[PDB]
Amino acid sequence: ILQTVRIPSQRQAIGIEVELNEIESRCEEYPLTRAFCQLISTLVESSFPSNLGAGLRPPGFDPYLQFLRDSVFLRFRTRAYRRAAEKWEVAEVVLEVFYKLLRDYEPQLEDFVDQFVELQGEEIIAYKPPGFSLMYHLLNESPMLELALSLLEEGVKQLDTYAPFPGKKHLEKAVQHCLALLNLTLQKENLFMDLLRESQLALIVCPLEQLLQGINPRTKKADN
Amino acid sequence: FVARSIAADHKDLIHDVSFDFHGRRMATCSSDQSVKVWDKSESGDWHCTASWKTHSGSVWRVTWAHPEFGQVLASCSFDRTAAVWEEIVGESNDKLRGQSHWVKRTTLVDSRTSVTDVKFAPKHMGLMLATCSADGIVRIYEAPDVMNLSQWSLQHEISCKLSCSCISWNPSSSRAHSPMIAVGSDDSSPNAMAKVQIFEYNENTRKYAKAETLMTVTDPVHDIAFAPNLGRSFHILAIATKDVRIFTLKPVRKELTSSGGPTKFEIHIVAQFDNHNSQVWRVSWNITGTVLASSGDDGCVRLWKANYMDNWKCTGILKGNGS
Amino acid sequence: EELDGEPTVTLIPGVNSKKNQMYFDWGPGEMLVCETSFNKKEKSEMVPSCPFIYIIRKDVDVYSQILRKLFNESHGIFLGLQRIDEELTGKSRKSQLVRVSKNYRSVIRACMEEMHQVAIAAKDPANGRQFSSQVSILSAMELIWNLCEILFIEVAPAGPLLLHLLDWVRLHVCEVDSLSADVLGSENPSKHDSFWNLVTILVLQGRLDEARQMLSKEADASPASAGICRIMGDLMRTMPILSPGNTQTLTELELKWQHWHEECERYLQDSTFATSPHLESLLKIMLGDEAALLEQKELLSNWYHFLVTRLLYSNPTVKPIDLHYYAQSSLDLFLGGESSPEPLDNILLAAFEFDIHQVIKECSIALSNWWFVAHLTDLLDHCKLLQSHNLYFGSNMREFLLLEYASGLFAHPSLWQLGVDYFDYCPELGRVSLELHIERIPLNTEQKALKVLRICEQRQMTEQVRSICKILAMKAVRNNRLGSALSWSIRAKDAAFATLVSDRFLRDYCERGCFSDLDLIDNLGPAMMLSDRLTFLGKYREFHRMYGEKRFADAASLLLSLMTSRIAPRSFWMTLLTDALPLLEQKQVIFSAEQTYELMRCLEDLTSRRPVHGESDTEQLQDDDIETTKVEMLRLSLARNLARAIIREGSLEGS
Amino acid sequence: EEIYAKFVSQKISKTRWRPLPPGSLQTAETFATGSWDNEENYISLWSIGDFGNLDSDGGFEGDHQLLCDIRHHGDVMDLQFFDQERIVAASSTGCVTVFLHHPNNQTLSVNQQWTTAHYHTGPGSPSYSSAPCTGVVCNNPEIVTVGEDGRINLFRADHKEAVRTIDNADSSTLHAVTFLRTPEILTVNSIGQLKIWDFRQQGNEPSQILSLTGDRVPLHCVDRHPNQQHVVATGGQDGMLSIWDVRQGTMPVSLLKAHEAEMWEVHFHPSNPEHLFTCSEDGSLWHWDASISSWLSTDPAKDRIEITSLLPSRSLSVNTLDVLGPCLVCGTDAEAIYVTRHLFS
């Protein structure tokens, strides 16, 4: 219903990744994708199997995080909306899933080891934890960090008017989950950065203390 | 100059050769009564694509139309005729094995004597054709349609009153000179004091009026060519005779009192070259009219150019080695 | 004056000039030649020769595959030069023109060294010699360009002129550094047989601290000469050479060099070197002894290295306006009067006389390609030195050379695009030279023809745009591609050609019952109005765009307008009458009485023109069974609409 | 980073990357080119020179090394890879040729050839006239081509004949062609239309047509988004860029100006397709970043497309480009090629 197994001959996707971009993105109303984000939002707190997708693909969560990050979140500001509130009703139910996936993940040294799995006669690396994927996407100058910090700017930029506006309570929640994500990074950052130093994995990551001082591409100050 | 070579398999003397406007095709004609078309490949080769009989006499020229009229050829003959040919896609009939896809659309027959030369007109006039013949006349024909190339109206008979050997249209697309044609003569008589004559279409009388006659060309003429016009306020004219000649023809501006008559020219000889030590049998210009070529009984094609002072000299000799 | 030698003689193989006449014609880069011989067998058993045709390409170099690098890079540099500002002050502009000169030199060098490796890689010694010959031509070009740069572009003053002329020799007389490797790579450098020759040649190039280092290998090996070799080497360190970072006068250099000469000659009077004749020769060479310098002629590979040696050791304060006399006097002494100078010597002498026009003239005789002379003359107008004087035909000398070179790029299948830009900077004759070439580009594809049309449309060459569009419309008409034929005649804006393509579509319809295109006729837009017959084609498709798609009185008045026009073909008037039958016999009167009379007037000028001629053949009858049936149904339906119309129209004159 | 230009003494009409092995971690190492407007045209295979190294004797080995060539017949109008050793090309002769690389030899050869794939006809005899084949698209084992004859052909890399032909799919030239789905293609023409064809249908007529409104802009190139079968991009005779959703009427969704001329190729990035690239007869080459898919926003003054000229100057015409991972290549009428290993630095 999300296509995790994309076939090399197949020129169109199947499931909600089509229905979001060919049906909801024609109605300018988004009930199917919000109900899918709400389905994942329960299914993280009742947990996910570590072997999820094994034998059909590499095991783990990141194919669902790719849809929520790269097909929902990074496109929530480039879609049009019949409900001027639903731009924020979509942001609430995706940042809730990311918040839960970073709340309950605690870093471990095997997150920094590339575990291999046999798949139909070839040896392939597993999908890293969704909280490790979230840490790596917040400890870099990512489009996800652009969209987080330019949501904190956009939030104050509505609130400093003191006015009522459509969907206001969902923007205040979407800011709350955005702050709580960055705070969960800072509360786990040192452990993630030292397990990277012991494991000697060939990644690069920067402290969120310092990425928060990056030049905001809107205002062109360090004003995050 | 770098040479490639081709066996031409004409079964008697070849009389003429002419390029298409793009230099992608060429035509040749012979005393064997044939014309041949040869085409240049997308590999740099040349291949014979049509080789057919055109006439009943020896063929004395072959010439192409400009390609805004498509793919059309003309040929003149000792049988007193000229013929017009069109290249057709898909007509070529196995019911009549060994005929060409170059089809004869018409034959012109009105000359009383051998048709010595044939030239298509500058395209701005229309689809027009000139021929000349040893009755001492030039004849000019017009096609009223570009597709029905069977139908040609004879619009002008032009009286030289000496035999005609060659003709040249003036290559002026500039609407500040009226239509012009120059004519050479093979006449060996000592009585005719000039062997080149020049005619102008005069709008005020609607016929080719005789504007000028080159009273320094006492000697028989075998070929004649106007130089392509790089914007010049004056024309340049090459002539093949006992020697090579290059004339200038600069229009005298009419006063606002000389109505109805033709123009007149300030005429010079800029060059006369004996250097062939023999008669001259063709004169043709490069595309910009800056270099002349001419051939003779010395077995040399000789090249001629202006220097920076308009002093014309020989610049190259293309000649056979016989090895 | 110009062209006072023999006119360049090409030999043609097989062709028997010894009595045989010739015919010829001109194409874009090739001239045809054909011979008048045909060998009608006087009884000998041999094969009879057919006549032969010859294709004679312009000689000039443009087809050498490596030189296409030189032509594209020097088009980039030429367009970098035609985009320099004239107000750029005579220090910024002179530095920038010296860069443009050194850019052009870099391309000659980078084509020559590529061609040198290709000459080494040549698996046939014939091909290796053909590349090696062109390497020598590129070397001669960069030798002449390095001199013309020093004299006319950088314009070296007295003092620095000798530094410029020393590295002018050094950048081309590269023999010395190769010989340095052989001598230095040996187990005993001071015992390689060429060691003393190399020590002398380094002194003849003024490379005095390199010559000191070679003399050190005699001093390390030979403790008997070493003391005297070090006096020579220390004189090779006291020589006053000009230093570009150093705030001295020419008179200071002059007075110091006069002391150095008065000290070198002093060591010759006390006979200091008369124990080694090689060191005695080096002292005479370093004193400017014109006899000892000519004893070194087998170590001076050319007269201009002898000249620069003679300036280094006999006149270090030489000026441009002294220089001619030393150049001639060094050519005199090097050739001795039993040899004539070569074409390169005549060019280099004229450069030392500073006659830019004699240099341009002899370069136009010694170099097979206008490429050199055109780019050099262009750069010397950017220095404002020239026959920017008008010629007898209006254009200037820079333009006259660019026109022959641009015509030389149009003589090649690819390079004609560069040839367009080389015509746009030619103000008197460039445009007309372009307008005579541009229609003759082979139009193999519509895509190639779009590039040529774009070039003509940019430059407002509007009758050539009409020509090329009619050549494309006629490509399409001979191939029956009616959509390209109509679209190209619309770009040509020729109403007779637009009518003629409509007089294919309207027959192609009758030859099928349908058109070979519909979308092309529907999307005519404003271009429908290019003729009456194209307007009729668009409007008969528009009638056929109400028959599945709309109504009736709109369609009927359109049908009558199509019929009564001078535009409907009369072989189709029986059809347009038949097309009225479903509109005439309607319960609503759709044509008026007045309109029904014009429909009958058209049926009458169809029917009243059948000839009354008799009896042959039988198979003709069975469409006259049908024609009479067509005509009677038309009489009956037109009379029925007329009666219904008169009753409807006359009652609206009566209430 | 900086871009490594090379003169090759032939105009380059087409360039293409060699397809990478599925599940490899290589950059694009090898490309193919085709040439036009010579006395002799060619198809050539090249490696990207290695700017990372010098050895003891100081030689610059960082040139784009020629691996091997083969001579062509006509101009190389269009070019595509078919697998990791085979290539297909069109021609001004109307010929279509499949070639094969030989890694064990460093040579090219013909593999199969359709010498009469495109041709114009005439009244009653098979004396056909040459029609330039203009575009080629592959769907291994299957191949499709277009031309001046307005013909569509379907060919196969196991079969010698045409599998299907459709003469006069237009009365004008067809310029380019792409697959929407395996039996379902889209073509572009001299009128300013996109015509859609389904090889399942037993008629020859189009399954759907799209156009501009009335005034004719010929459409020279076409591509279709790697993750969206319904999203199409086309390039005009004017230098406009048109984005279409083929399911939502007859018109483009988004209309942008890209050049001051004829736009010769348009491509979506094969892994990053919210990025686009274009080349033209205006002498320029551009990258476009837009990260609903941003190409389908009807207001590009709200939603972004941020736009970069990749060439530091304007040359003679840029006929072609290809982009694979971080690598990009283009080909020009300046008898030259331009390459980078890195587009994101």
mmCIF file of C-alpha atoms in Angstrom, chain A:
data_model
loop_
_atom_site.group_PDB
_atom_site.id
_atom_site.type_symbol
_atom_site.label_atom_id
_atom_site.label_comp_id
_atom_site.label_asym_id
_atom_site.label_seq_id
_atom_site.Cartn_x
_atom_site.Cartn_y
_atom_site.Cartn_z
ATOM 1 C CA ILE A 1 0.000 0.000 0.000
ATOM 2 C CA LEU A 2 3.250 1.902 0.103
ATOM 3 C CA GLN A 3 5.460 0.232 -2.561
ATOM 4 C CA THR A 4 8.709 -0.613 -0.677
ATOM 5 C CA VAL A 5 9.724 -3.135 -3.444
ATOM 6 C CA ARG A 6 10.167 -0.969 -6.607
ATOM 7 C CA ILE A 7 10.713 -3.349 -9.611
ATOM 8 C CA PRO A 8 13.509 -2.403 -12.195
ATOM 9 C CA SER A 9 11.099 -2.722 -15.224
ATOM 10 C CA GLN A 10 8.310 -0.646 -13.599
ATOM 11 C CA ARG A 11 7.982 2.968 -14.941
ATOM 12 C CA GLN A 12 5.119 4.075 -12.538
ATOM 13 C CA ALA A 13 4.930 3.508 -8.747
ATOM 14 C CA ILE A 14 1.910 1.793 -7.041
ATOM 15 C CA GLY A 15 -0.064 2.658 -3.846
ATOM 16 C CA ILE A 16 -0.343 5.902 -1.810
ATOM 17 C CA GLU A 17 2.796 7.427 -3.481
ATOM 18 C CA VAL A 18 0.626 7.670 -6.664
ATOM 19 C CA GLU A 19 -2.693 8.529 -4.909
ATOM 20 C CA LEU A 20 -1.060 11.481 -3.009
ATOM 21 C CA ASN A 21 0.539 12.947 -6.192
ATOM 22 C CA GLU A 22 -2.249 12.102 -8.760
ATOM 23 C CA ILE A 23 -5.496 12.234 -6.645
ATOM 24 C CA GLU A 24 -4.989 14.293 -3.409
ATOM 25 C CA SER A 25 -2.653 16.756 -5.265
ATOM 26 C CA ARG A 26 -5.590 17.250 -7.750
ATOM 27 C CA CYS A 27 -8.358 17.695 -5.132
ATOM 28 C CA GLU A 28 -6.181 20.048 -2.979
ATOM 29 C CA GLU A 29 -7.470 18.023 0.056
ATOM 30 C CA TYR A 30 -5.345 15.307 1.730
ATOM 31 C CA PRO A 31 -7.436 12.794 3.825
ATOM 32 C CA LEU A 32 -5.680 9.570 2.580
ATOM 33 C CA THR A 33 -2.070 10.681 3.291
ATOM 34 C CA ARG A 34 -3.072 12.149 6.709
ATOM 35 C CA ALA A 35 -4.826 8.861 7.622
ATOM 36 C CA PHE A 36 -1.670 6.937 6.488
ATOM 37 C CA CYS A 37 0.567 9.194 8.660
ATOM 38 C CA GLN A 38 -1.897 8.561 11.570
ATOM 39 C CA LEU A 39 -1.666 4.761 10.899
ATOM 40 C CA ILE A 40 2.178 4.906 11.146
ATOM 41 C CA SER A 41 1.791 7.242 14.213
ATOM 42 C CA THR A 42 0.054 4.434 16.203
ATOM 43 C CA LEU A 43 2.276 1.648 14.734
ATOM 44 C CA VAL A 44 5.524 3.296 16.021
ATOM 45 C CA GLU A 45 4.244 3.311 19.674
ATOM 46 C CA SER A 46 3.159 -0.360 19.406
ATOM 47 C CA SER A 47 6.667 -0.765 17.743
ATOM 48 C CA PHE A 48 7.851 -2.178 14.367
ATOM 49 C CA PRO A 49 9.563 -5.585 13.681
ATOM 50 C CA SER A 50 13.368 -5.222 13.117
ATOM 51 C CA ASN A 51 13.070 -7.853 10.309
ATOM 52 C CA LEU A 52 10.334 -5.761 8.514
ATOM 53 C CA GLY A 53 10.731 -6.440 4.740
ATOM 54 C CA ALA A 54 13.406 -9.227 5.049
ATOM 55 C CA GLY A 55 13.798 -11.539 1.969
ATOM 56 C CA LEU A 56 11.701 -9.066 -0.136
ATOM 57 C CA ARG A 57 14.243 -6.218 0.537
ATOM 58 C CA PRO A 58 16.902 -5.288 3.171
ATOM 59 C CA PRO A 59 15.238 -5.339 6.659
ATOM 60 C CA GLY A 60 14.252 -2.174 8.609
ATOM 61 C CA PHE A 61 12.165 1.038 8.498
ATOM 62 C CA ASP A 62 13.811 3.650 6.175
ATOM 63 C CA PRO A 63 11.587 2.920 3.025
ATOM 64 C CA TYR A 64 8.615 4.270 5.113
ATOM 65 C CA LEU A 65 10.772 7.214 6.328
ATOM 66 C CA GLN A 66 11.689 7.962 2.629
ATOM 67 C CA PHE A 67 7.962 8.287 1.836
ATOM 68 C CA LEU A 68 7.226 10.478 4.919
ATOM 69 C CA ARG A 69 10.431 12.631 4.450
ATOM 70 C CA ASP A 70 10.979 12.786 0.662
ATOM 71 C CA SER A 71 7.351 12.314 -0.667
ATOM 72 C CA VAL A 72 5.238 13.912 2.169
ATOM 73 C CA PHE A 73 7.298 16.378 4.331
ATOM 74 C CA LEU A 74 9.725 17.930 1.743
ATOM 75 C CA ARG A 75 6.598 18.421 -0.511
ATOM 76 C CA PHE A 76 4.119 19.770 2.154
ATOM 77 C CA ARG A 77 5.125 23.386 1.197
ATOM 78 C CA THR A 78 4.988 22.876 -2.641
ATOM 79 C CA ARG A 79 1.398 21.471 -2.727
ATOM 80 C CA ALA A 80 -1.743 23.650 -2.975
ATOM 81 C CA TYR A 81 -4.588 23.358 -0.385
ATOM 82 C CA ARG A 82 -8.392 23.964 -0.628
ATOM 83 C CA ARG A 83 -8.278 23.887 3.196
ATOM 84 C CA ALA A 84 -5.833 26.699 4.146
ATOM 85 C CA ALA A 85 -5.613 24.814 7.520
ATOM 86 C CA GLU A 86 -4.618 21.413 5.973
ATOM 87 C CA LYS A 87 -1.108 22.690 5.116
ATOM 88 C CA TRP A 88 -0.698 22.504 8.947
ATOM 89 C CA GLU A 89 -2.935 19.400 9.556
ATOM 90 C CA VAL A 90 -0.409 17.507 7.279
ATOM 91 C CA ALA A 91 2.601 18.958 9.185
ATOM 92 C CA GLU A 92 1.243 17.841 12.632
ATOM 93 C CA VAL A 93 0.777 14.125 11.693
ATOM 94 C CA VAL A 94 4.244 13.785 10.008
ATOM 95 C CA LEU A 95 6.300 15.631 12.665
ATOM 96 C CA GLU A 96 4.479 13.488 15.306
ATOM 97 C CA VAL A 97 5.842 10.298 13.591
ATOM 98 C CA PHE A 98 9.387 11.765 13.384
ATOM 99 C CA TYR A 99 9.161 12.886 17.065
ATOM 100 C CA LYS A 100 8.116 9.327 18.193
ATOM 101 C CA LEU A 101 10.895 7.711 16.055
ATOM 102 C CA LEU A 102 13.526 9.988 17.789
ATOM 103 C CA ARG A 103 11.893 9.821 21.309
ATOM 104 C CA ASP A 104 12.153 6.011 21.640
ATOM 105 C CA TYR A 105 15.406 5.379 19.672
ATOM 106 C CA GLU A 106 18.562 5.384 21.859
ATOM 107 C CA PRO A 107 21.944 5.172 19.960
ATOM 108 C CA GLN A 108 23.942 1.883 20.041
ATOM 109 C CA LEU A 109 27.374 0.909 18.594
ATOM 110 C CA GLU A 110 25.800 -1.540 16.039
ATOM 111 C CA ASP A 111 23.950 1.464 14.450
ATOM 112 C CA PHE A 112 27.502 2.418 13.314
ATOM 113 C CA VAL A 113 28.248 -1.143 11.973
ATOM 114 C CA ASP A 114 27.125 -2.157 8.448
ATOM 115 C CA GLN A 115 25.192 -5.421 9.030
ATOM 116 C CA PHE A 116 25.005 -7.548 5.805
ATOM 117 C CA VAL A 117 22.072 -9.853 4.817
ATOM 118 C CA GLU A 118 21.745 -12.486 2.027
ATOM 119 C CA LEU A 119 19.049 -11.490 -0.513
ATOM 120 C CA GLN A 120 18.378 -13.995 -3.343
ATOM 121 C CA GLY A 121 22.132 -14.896 -3.577
ATOM 122 C CA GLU A 122 23.711 -11.379 -3.152
ATOM 123 C CA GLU A 123 25.077 -9.813 0.119
ATOM 124 C CA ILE A 124 23.346 -6.454 0.943
ATOM 125 C CA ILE A 125 23.517 -3.974 3.902
ATOM 126 C CA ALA A 126 20.422 -3.590 6.190
ATOM 127 C CA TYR A 127 18.438 -0.316 6.619
ATOM 128 C CA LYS A 128 19.860 1.570 9.659
ATOM 129 C CA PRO A 129 17.453 2.514 12.544
ATOM 130 C CA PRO A 130 14.871 5.257 11.686
ATOM 131 C CA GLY A 131 16.180 7.292 14.677
ATOM 132 C CA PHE A 132 19.777 6.975 13.283
ATOM 133 C CA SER A 133 18.392 8.176 9.884
ATOM 134 C CA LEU A 134 16.667 11.117 11.718
ATOM 135 C CA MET A 135 19.898 11.978 13.671
ATOM 136 C CA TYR A 136 21.973 11.949 10.422
ATOM 137 C CA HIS A 137 19.345 14.185 8.657
ATOM 138 C CA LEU A 138 19.384 16.697 11.625
ATOM 139 C CA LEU A 139 23.221 16.663 12.198
ATOM 140 C CA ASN A 140 23.774 17.999 8.603
ATOM 141 C CA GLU A 141 22.700 21.026 6.437
ATOM 142 C CA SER A 142 19.812 18.899 5.030
ATOM 143 C CA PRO A 143 16.564 19.969 3.235
ATOM 144 C CA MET A 144 14.827 18.412 6.309
ATOM 145 C CA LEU A 145 16.734 20.850 8.603
ATOM 146 C CA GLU A 146 15.904 23.745 6.161
ATOM 147 C CA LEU A 147 12.224 22.733 6.469
ATOM 148 C CA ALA A 148 12.448 22.410 10.304
ATOM 149 C CA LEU A 149 14.248 25.767 10.960
ATOM 150 C CA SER A 150 12.156 27.606 8.315
ATOM 151 C CA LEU A 151 9.062 26.167 10.138
ATOM 152 C CA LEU A 152 10.299 27.718 13.427
ATOM 153 C CA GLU A 153 10.775 31.062 11.548
ATOM 154 C CA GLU A 154 7.325 30.710 9.851
ATOM 155 C CA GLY A 155 5.692 29.897 13.252
ATOM 156 C CA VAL A 156 7.003 33.049 15.055
ATOM 157 C CA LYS A 157 6.247 35.025 11.832
ATOM 158 C CA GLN A 158 2.529 34.079 12.199
ATOM 159 C CA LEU A 159 2.395 34.264 16.056
ATOM 160 C CA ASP A 160 4.023 37.762 16.435
ATOM 161 C CA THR A 161 0.820 39.192 14.777
ATOM 162 C CA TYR A 162 -1.188 37.759 17.763
ATOM 163 C CA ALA A 163 -4.055 37.074 15.257
ATOM 164 C CA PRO A 164 -6.396 34.062 14.748
ATOM 165 C CA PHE A 165 -5.814 32.192 11.422
ATOM 166 C CA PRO A 166 -7.163 28.955 9.767
ATOM 167 C CA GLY A 167 -5.552 25.829 11.278
ATOM 168 C CA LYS A 168 -3.568 27.906 13.895
ATOM 169 C CA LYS A 169 -3.640 25.116 16.594
ATOM 170 C CA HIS A 170 -2.043 22.654 14.071
ATOM 171 C CA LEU A 171 0.799 25.138 13.276
ATOM 172 C CA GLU A 172 1.435 25.574 17.055
ATOM 173 C CA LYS A 173 1.657 21.714 17.340
ATOM 174 C CA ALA A 174 3.842 21.487 14.177
ATOM 175 C CA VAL A 175 6.221 24.013 15.858
ATOM 176 C CA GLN A 176 6.026 22.011 19.167
ATOM 177 C CA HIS A 177 7.102 18.732 17.446
ATOM 178 C CA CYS A 178 9.797 20.680 15.497
ATOM 179 C CA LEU A 179 11.287 22.117 18.758
ATOM 180 C CA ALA A 180 10.992 18.710 20.518
ATOM 181 C CA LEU A 181 12.858 16.993 17.593
ATOM 182 C CA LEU A 182 15.811 19.463 17.815
ATOM 183 C CA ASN A 183 15.779 19.114 21.640
ATOM 184 C CA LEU A 184 15.833 15.258 21.367
ATOM 185 C CA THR A 185 18.845 15.597 18.990
ATOM 186 C CA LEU A 186 20.747 17.810 21.533
ATOM 187 C CA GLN A 187 19.829 15.346 24.382
ATOM 188 C CA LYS A 188 21.352 12.377 22.341
ATOM 189 C CA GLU A 189 23.995 14.169 20.144
ATOM 190 C CA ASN A 190 27.151 13.558 22.254
ATOM 191 C CA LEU A 191 26.437 9.769 22.534
ATOM 192 C CA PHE A 192 25.786 9.576 18.741
ATOM 193 C CA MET A 193 29.031 11.556 18.055
ATOM 194 C CA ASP A 194 31.242 9.369 20.376
ATOM 195 C CA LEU A 195 29.828 6.014 19.096
ATOM 196 C CA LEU A 196 30.808 7.388 15.621
ATOM 197 C CA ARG A 197 34.367 8.090 17.001
ATOM 198 C CA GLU A 198 34.780 4.524 18.416
ATOM 199 C CA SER A 199 33.249 2.762 15.338
ATOM 200 C CA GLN A 200 35.381 4.905 12.919
ATOM 201 C CA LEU A 201 32.524 4.865 10.312
ATOM 202 C CA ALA A 202 33.318 7.079 7.244
ATOM 203 C CA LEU A 203 30.372 9.524 7.806
ATOM 204 C CA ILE A 204 30.426 13.297 8.450
ATOM 205 C CA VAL A 205 27.994 15.067 10.843
ATOM 206 C CA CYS A 206 28.054 18.536 12.501
ATOM 207 C CA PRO A 207 26.814 19.541 16.035
ATOM 208 C CA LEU A 208 23.215 20.899 16.031
ATOM 209 C CA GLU A 209 24.506 23.689 18.361
ATOM 210 C CA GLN A 210 26.484 24.918 15.287
ATOM 211 C CA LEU A 211 24.044 24.048 12.433
ATOM 212 C CA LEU A 212 21.499 26.259 14.315
ATOM 213 C CA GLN A 213 24.018 29.107 13.600
ATOM 214 C CA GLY A 214 23.931 28.418 9.803
ATOM 215 C CA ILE A 215 22.892 31.338 7.553
ATOM 216 C CA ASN A 216 19.064 31.167 7.189
ATOM 217 C CA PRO A 217 18.590 31.263 3.337
ATOM 218 C CA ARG A 218 15.432 33.473 3.780
ATOM 219 C CA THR A 219 16.706 36.271 6.113
ATOM 220 C CA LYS A 220 20.487 35.798 5.503
ATOM 221 C CA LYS A 221 21.304 36.080 9.243
ATOM 222 C CA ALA A 222 22.342 33.248 11.661
ATOM 223 C CA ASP A 223 18.864 33.857 13.166
ATOM 224 C CA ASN A 224 17.601 30.255 13.803
#
